[PDB]
Amino acid sequence: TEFKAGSAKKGATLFKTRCLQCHTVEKGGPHKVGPNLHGIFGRHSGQAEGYSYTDANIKKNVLWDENNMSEYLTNHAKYIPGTKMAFGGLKKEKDRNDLITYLKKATE
Numbered sequence: 032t033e034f035k036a037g038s039a040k041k042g043a044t045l046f047k048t049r050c051l052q053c054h055t056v057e058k059g060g061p062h063k064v065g066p067n068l069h070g071i072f073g074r075h076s077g078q079a080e081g082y083s084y085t086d087a088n089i090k091k092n093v094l095w096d097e098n099n100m101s102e103y104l105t106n107h108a109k110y111i112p113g114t115k116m117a118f119g120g121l122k123k124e125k126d127r128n129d130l131i132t133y134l135k136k137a138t139e
């Protein structure tokens with residue numbers, strides 16, 4: 032519901048030191064461990080260019096937004112339970128705030 036911020040600087044590296052392991056910034060990346068985002072902030076859940084999300088996640092589709100994504104970060108699968116989970120726990124708002132700060136800057 033409410034969006035919090037802090038510093039994109041660290042948030043930019045947070046993605047590189049965490050999401051990079053599974054997600055790739057390049058659009059249509061190899062999708063090794065999981066599908067690659069980059070630009071999905073303005074798309075519905077389940078829409079990808081290289082690898083489509085899991086049929087379960089694809090069954091459920093929701094428009095993405097900085098506010099909507101904030102809730103998803105709390106749980107790799109909140110409104111989209113069909114989506115798989117595997118993140119340590121970005122429950123800390125400090126990481127989630129700076130994280131999206133960089134993603135929003137790019138989508139900006």
Ligand code: HEC
Nearest residue numbers: 049050052053064065066071076077083084085088115117
């Ligand atoms: C591998 C162990 C992962 C790491 C580490 C991160 N994510 Fe992930 N993420 C992973 C999977 C398995 C999936 C979906 C599987 C499928 O194919 O459906 C996801 C999905 C997301 C999404 C959902 C958005 C959407 O496309 O609908 C987001 C926004 C997301 N992941 C963000 C994200 C960030 C911020 C990470 C770094 C902090 C991160 N993921 C790491 C697997 C893995």
